[model samples]
Target chain A: TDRTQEIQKLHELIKNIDYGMFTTVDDDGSLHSYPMSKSGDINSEATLWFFTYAGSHKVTEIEHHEQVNVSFSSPEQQRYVSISGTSQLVKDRNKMRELWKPELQTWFPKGLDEPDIALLKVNINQVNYWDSFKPQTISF
Target chain B: TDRTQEIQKLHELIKNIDYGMFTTVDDDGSLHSYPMSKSGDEATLWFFTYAGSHKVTEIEHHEQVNVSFSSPEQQRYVSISGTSQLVKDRNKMRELWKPELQTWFPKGLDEPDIALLKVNINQVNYWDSTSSFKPQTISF
Candidate 1:
């Protein structure tokens, strides 16, 4: 319907936007928030990608708890996208190169070949997004 | 030494507090926050348990996550960082059980197919109003 079309348009506008906030609950029952450079595929697939060190605490946490939540914000556009879903660690070499960019070296100094590098493939289930262009924020 | 004390205090505060906020990213890249209960302990782990048929599938897709808890009533807050893993452990499930939880799981904690999440904490940041304004960073 109209809402679906609006959501599609909203997704398109933010698809290319960089950076998102990832939050996870730790075994200690505390909250963790971090800024991550990632992308989202909103049209045909509901997924997001994250690159991290294999030995990082974040990776260990994911290995323990598979449930997670992610958020994307475009301060320039004053838009926000919130997604809640589950994540799996992926170790495909070719897929890593496909998503890899020079900027990622800042986080993974060893580059894509970093032995500890791992890909977090998030499968989004529920999404609630808002754009200033709309008179009232929309959620799904 | 000072950092260790601070981390210990934060852990104690979180364990005593009953609830926290679970934040996640959506398919469109927005942030979603929900108030949830705290279950389990550090040794066995804990989580913000949701029904298996819920929106967590989407969360699994996006592993980048953060979780925060505050007891404004007590003037304490805990921010934790970790990756997530969706697990199904009946023993851990029963250990985290409370009679009050029967309202959510009619078949009880021993029911087959129950999903128990074990969030392995990577880093813990906390603030104690009784202490000082500066937040303490703790690594486990």
Candidate 2:
């Protein structure tokens, strides 16, 4: 991919952070966010994924408005990254099994077979990062 | 002051995080977020920024914003949704000033373009380690 270098750089930072505040806009146009565990690595296509309960409010919000932002923070390191992308509900059983981990059993107690378990796939268009106040950006 | 217990718990967790990913909607209806230092606390939040920054511009166009805080080591995360406005009061800026911020504002409070983005939190959702990751919420 043309963005291999940038993707690698983003993966390095994101893997350490592990969680991102997944934000979506409500029907009233008010922004809402909740911390979502990062499920898998940023892929070659610059797509990232998160595990979500299929019926959660966030999924509803995503359906209503596809544009969303996920922000990661590691305060001690003074590093942060914000990713803006379009999200869609992915029900691929094969992909879910590929990404599932034993640790995720804490949330998905029924394991990969949990009927409501789904993946929120984000196709990142822009990533903005700050090791401090200055921001560096990469666009797909 | 009425939701004292919830507010107290949120304050304790947030103080440890220090930085928040402040999110806003861009003019084209896309979501954007970046790390912002929390200048002060309580039910309302204050953030320092430059007058003509993109976030400031976005806030001017759409007052709704979301501030998210996460601490992986402590297993806590918080999301605060609120309305925001730009404030340029010198006295308030002086009160929230910290030596740590000098890295961004070398001249301190007198830094030519220094301004504040005040977020009056309307709703808060948080997960604490002790709660087994269930979201606890409070609304103003």
Candidate 3:
């Protein structure tokens, strides 16, 4: 399949998955991960977004090292995705408003008006998906 | 919760989740991850994997890794930090082995590439709506 078809398939696979474990590398080289909800479906360019605190521990780690991994899994359906990407903190009000959803208000009580609220844009470098003993990978 | 209770809780939370995205650091400092099916029970996590997989090399280079589990339908999530070792013991492999795993290792214990990935949990953070989204953390 072409890139667009692949990205569309990827989007369909994760659109209902809701949350992913976003992993980052600490200065000591230890790995840490936390559940982060994907703000919306992945874009055609393979960029994924998340709402986060401006300088949260994850953002700090991304600042020091752009590489990160966001993984999604639904065991009942036997679908799993591991996405390796480069992260950038995005503070664009327009874009944030574009992707905003009601559920996010739980985390950002003030909604789009939340002062410290920021967006994380992860430009995916590779995606590995599995439904069996062998996996398929798409590299950017 | 005390250490033992917390350990039990952690086990309970992740046992039903069959897959986790295990993340590791590359030699160049980039983060990468992929799904691995959970095989063992209790405190230490075990996975049936191939010895020749690239992740095995990553673990050898950097012992620290992250395995994140998510069950979005129930809003339960877990992130674990641990050190991984590639175990090649035939006895241990036979103990953890199951019929389903034959899909990957048709030759069973004698499969040339068959191996075990053992992750000793050091720290865990989990979240569920029952707890109001405030992640509960425990350290070994």
Candidate 4:
């Protein structure tokens, strides 16, 4: 398949992924990886969203340095999707409510109203995805 | 407490904690975090012993980073941001080596193949059992 067509197929596979591993560079040049739930579609532009605490280091890293990379893996389906891009923090109460779920209450007992609650919108510019469908999956 | 005092206290705390979550940015600008067993003293200088890990390569690319220590069971956490350099100080290595560490580097403390990392912390933000909500920031 052509690169453009392959990218679209990769986006489709990524959208089906429910979990993502977000990694950030700390102030000391080390890598910090965290697991976040998929919050939205891999947009036509291939962006991803994650809800995080404003006070968390992850958010601080994004604020200090917008560059980020997200990896999505589906063990049951044997697939992996990696997207590299920059992230911006968004604060919208209504949007937070729309994304709220029971699992979030554990971290935010006050629900979406938690002051630290923030949306991490990642704009993916490049992506590499793979599935075991082919014996030797090509990465793009 | 004064900034210096706070830094001193944090340095002591970090030493006792003994583990840190290290982070770095990859060549593609993706962040990665890894747990490392490192050591330091009241000087606030942190060091880690690693062998051919991708982290070394990541550090070679970007030097600005952050490290965090959280004892969830104790509800205490400290995050420090700083620059790192690959150190080859034999004395420092000898001082930080332990019997258990020998298993990771068979040649023991004097192993010529071993590499030592020295991270000089420039700033620190911490939350402890006594102060859970407020994170006190200290500048070195």
Evaluated with DockQ, which candidate comes out highest? 2
lDDT of 2 by residue, A13-67 (tens): 7887767889999888788998887777776879988888899989999999999
Error of 3 at A131 (Å): 3.3
RMSD to true structure for each model, in Å: 11.7, 1.6, 2.0, 7.9
Taken over the whole model, the C-alpha lDDT of each candidate is 0.61, 0.87, 0.85, 0.65
> Model 3: per-residue lDDT, tens digit, B1-140?
48779888887788777768889988987788887778877468999888999999999999999998888766788889999999999999989998887777889888999999999998898888867878888888
Candidate 1 Cα lDDT to native: 0.61
Q: Score every model by TM-score.
A: 0.48, 0.94, 0.92, 0.60
Worst 10 residues of 1 chain B by lDDT: B42-51
Q: Model 2 off-target regions past 4 Å?
A: none
Isolated chain A TM-score, each model: 0.76, 0.94, 0.93, 0.77
Sorting all predicted structures by lDDT, with the top scorer first, yields 2, 3, 4, 1
> Which lDDT tens digits does candidate 4 get at residues A1-140?
37556556766676665545566665655445454666755434455667888877788877877887666545446555556678889887776777778887877898776877888888766565555211222233
Candidate 2, residues B10-113: lDDT per residue as tens digits?
78878877778899999887899988789876578998899989889999999999999888888888889999999999999989999999987899887889
- iRMSD for every model: 8.4, 0.8, 1.1, 7.2
Candidate 3 displacement at residue A70 in angstroms: 0.9
How well does model 3 score by local distance difference test?
0.85
**Candidate 2: Cα lDDT at A137:** 91
